[PDB]
Amino acid sequence: GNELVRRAARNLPWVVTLAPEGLNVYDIVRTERLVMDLDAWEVFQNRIG
Amino acid sequence: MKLSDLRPNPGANKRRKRVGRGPGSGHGKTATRGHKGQKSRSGGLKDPRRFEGGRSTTLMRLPKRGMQGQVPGEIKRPRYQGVNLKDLARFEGEVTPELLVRAGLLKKGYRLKILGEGEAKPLKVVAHAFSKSALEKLKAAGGEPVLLE
Amino acid sequence: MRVKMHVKKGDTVLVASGKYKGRVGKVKEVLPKKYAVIVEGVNIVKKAVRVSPKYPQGGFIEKEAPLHASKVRPICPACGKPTRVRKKFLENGKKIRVCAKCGGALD
Amino acid sequence: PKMKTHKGAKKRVKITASGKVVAMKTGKRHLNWQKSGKEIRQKGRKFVLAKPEAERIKLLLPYE
RNA sequence: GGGGGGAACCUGGGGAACUGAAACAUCUCAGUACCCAGAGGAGAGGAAAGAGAAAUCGACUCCCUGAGUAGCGGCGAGCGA
RNA sequence: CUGUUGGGAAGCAGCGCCAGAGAGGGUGAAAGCCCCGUAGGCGAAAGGUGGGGGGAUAGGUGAGGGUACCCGAGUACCCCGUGGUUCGUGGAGCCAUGGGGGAAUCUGGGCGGACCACCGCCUAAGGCUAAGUACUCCGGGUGACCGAUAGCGCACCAGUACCGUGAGGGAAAGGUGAAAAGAACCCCGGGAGGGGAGUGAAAUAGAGCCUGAAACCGUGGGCUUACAAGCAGUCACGGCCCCGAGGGGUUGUGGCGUGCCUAUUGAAGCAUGAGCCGGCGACUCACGGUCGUGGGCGAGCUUAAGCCGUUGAGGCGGAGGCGUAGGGAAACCGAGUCCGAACAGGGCGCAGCGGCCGCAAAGUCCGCGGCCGUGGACCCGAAACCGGGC
RNA sequence: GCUGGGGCUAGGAGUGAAAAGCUAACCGAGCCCGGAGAUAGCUGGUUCUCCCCGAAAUGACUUUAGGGUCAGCCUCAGGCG
RNA sequence: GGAUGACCCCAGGCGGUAGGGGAGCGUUCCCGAUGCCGAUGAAGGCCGACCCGCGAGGGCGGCUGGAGGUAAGGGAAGUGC
RNA sequence: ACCCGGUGAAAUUGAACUGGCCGUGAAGAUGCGGCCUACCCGUGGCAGGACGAAAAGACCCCGUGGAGCUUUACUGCAGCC
């Protein structure tokens, strides 16, 4: 959810950036690794609950 | 697991039947329509559910029965839906129309009638009507039937 | 509204690509419509001319052929290096081209 | 556009709980004087439409 | 002040037929196509002599739904709140 | 930035660097850092707009009591003819009104589907009123949209040429190259055209220009052919030529042998269609249904319009739909119900696998597929009918 | 009587010493554009490959007879055995 | 058999129009892809007596061509004359 | 008309390496069988055949196709009473 973090990483070829409200399986399956905020991990657990 | 692994199960996505695409396919030329006649034509036949070649139809030779109604239409009257004792088994304490609505048991806009199938439970059940047997069973099981007006 | 030209007649430019890459020369002409520049003694071609009043004896003449303007980089009059151009606003408060490597005016 | 219900069928026929199609027996609308009581009585019942005809009629009642 | 124009859109005044009903006339197509008048960036509608059964709602317009229900119908084909 | 191959580097190699910018288009080939841009920011003296903010102004405002003055007229209302509505004369109300008759001012009047009573609802015969809605000539953004027979009729000087008295109809036609460096000059020729020279990485890239298929025409070569009977091939063998116990080409002789498609009981058929070649050319889509099927959940399954977010991110939203009970024209009753006097008889209905667990399943949602309904619904084709114009 | 020029009458309409003649080179109903992709139970056409199975040209009814609905006969899935 | 489309062995079926079913090939476009093939030559064209495939096709090689093409695995259609 | 110089169409055309008889064949065969005849290629001529070309027979029937016309067919409408 940190905009500053997303802005810094977004232009990297190997990085896809998302706010946790936007977590979706296409973007997960597209990428080799998943990296999340504890905060993001939390809204995720709320979403799948 | 990546994109090149994402795959439907066998049978989930099947190929279409394509006709009029050659001898080898089994569906060339006439495109599975046979030779001539109305059915082979673009636009085809009259409705097969009804039409019978000009003869008076199976349907139309049967008699009408009953009240069909008339303008200005449906007469408003209170409507009942029955829910069985067995369907009440999941509840505790007090059951009411709104609760049965919410549970997906009772449809909105319907008055509630309790029916005799299944076993009664000691519950206070609030309803617009009861079958005789529903009434008997609920008393015997120690429940409290409350009748609305 | 207007074609953006980072180079003008007749600053000194490096020809950064093509057969004449590495070459340096003054910009003889700028042709915005073709997005091209003419650079002195760069991109020489042999042109056939008819025996005419303009060319008695006829034969051939040498001509500078236009260069795609992106192939060309201005040379900083200050630090003498090929550079991209920046805009700087003066007190005037006009705007000028300035070198990117140092900060000198290119005019 | 969605299928329309055939009202001619809806007025003559009913789909039972197991998907049978039931209609009134024909032949007692009139000319009854010389028909035996057995004929009148038995024609006063419903009957189950033969399967091929029932399927056709059901298709006319998509929202029953 | 008016006149005339504007791709569709809009409202009003008029308004078919093929076709469908496996013929055809009621019916359908369809108040559609089209003609005309007018409007404007929209137009129409609009502040209950409404709804219609809730002891209820609260202008009008528009979308979802109600619902292919209620009904209408050579109770046919179909039409349809 | 350098080196390197190359006509050319952006390719490859070495060493770097930017990134709130690695969308995309260019540059001699394939470039984040060369160019135009992109992310992020900045900008109007003039004219337009201004639904947002601020301010004026117009307008806005009590209580009982009595009085019964007013409260939209050829109107309501009734009848006749008709329209609108789901309502086609129907028990036919309501709303509208062409004709006739023709009121009342709240103790007045219209409505709740003939009518009457009761009970309610509402205030006709004057007018205006943003917004949410529709459209796309215009500008922009974006495509599991087209790529010159496609996509608009038009990529190009097209509503043109041309056709028609006119209304009206209505085309074809895109590409040299990186750069014109678009071939000076000489040679044959009246010119056209060509041969040299020359430019170019390339000139069968030379302007009648990218690629350059096929029909079709020609030149050269190999095999073959003037005693032979043929859907033209095929099987065999032999001859010659070619490439080097094999193969390719050709075909002398011998065997066998009734084109293709369509339509038909039946066609080589003297039945249809086709000169040949290239390109265009016909079973689709939406919504609904019905089966099957791949999953999700399961007495439950599922959301629609919207709303928030995103800017190729997803979520919220339960209104509603299907299912959970049937039977009866219905009142109604209900695991039953209807017919019946019946407690008769009959019709239509009613009841998982394993050690609480799992599993499976009603059902339902979504995807996929077959087929059906509605639309032009596989494509092409009438003769005609109608409307408005010429 | 013929003829120049200037005019009027047109689509179910004109005009016709009448032939259903003529109304812009085909008139028992002009032409153009539109409804419109009218409708066509008729004729034609319907495009890659391989594999398994494999019909009918009957019966009933049909303003039906060269078209249909149902049955029969083919095929595929599940079930029974 | 072996346990499961691993391959082998024995056996039997395999003419086919309307038509049913099954399995595949190829075309355009999307994901894969900020990748990968590509001027030491893309696509397209012309040959081939070679390789794989039952076949539709797919490789490979020579020539042409001169700037694009696009895998395994999936998705969608203006998809084969 | 014919020949030489100049310019140079057309309908038609599955492809053709396109003979006779007697047969056969969907019943009138260059194309099938048997036999007979026949060196290869033209030019001017003739029309018996190619069921020669042209025109999706205008006769005839069929289509619940169309149109013009009629009437004591049906049902309307103008117009008149």
Ligand SMILES: NC(=[NH2+])NCCC[C@H](N)C(=O)O
């Ligand atoms: N908030 C975000 N990071 N959104 C997704 C990235 C946005 C943008 N499409 C990008 O890739 O640069």
Ligand SMILES: [Mg+2]
């Ligand atoms: Mg990105």
Ligand SMILES: [Mg+2]
């Ligand atoms: Mg990124």
Ligand SMILES: [Mg+2]
């Ligand atoms: Mg990625």
Ligand SMILES: [Mg+2]
């Ligand atoms: Mg991304």
Ligand SMILES: [Mg+2]
């Ligand atoms: Mg699909």
Ligand SMILES: [Mg+2]
């Ligand atoms: Mg489909």
Ligand SMILES: [Mg+2]
């Ligand atoms: Mg299949």
Ligand SMILES: [Mg+2]
């Ligand atoms: Mg296919």
Ligand SMILES: [Mg+2]
């Ligand atoms: Mg095929």
Ligand SMILES: [Mg+2]
């Ligand atoms: Mg098949």
Ligand SMILES: [Mg+2]
């Ligand atoms: Mg078949």
Ligand SMILES: [Mg+2]
């Ligand atoms: Mg065929």
Ligand SMILES: [Mg+2]
């Ligand atoms: Mg057909």
Ligand SMILES: [Mg+2]
């Ligand atoms: Mg079929």
Ligand SMILES: [Mg+2]
């Ligand atoms: Mg089929």
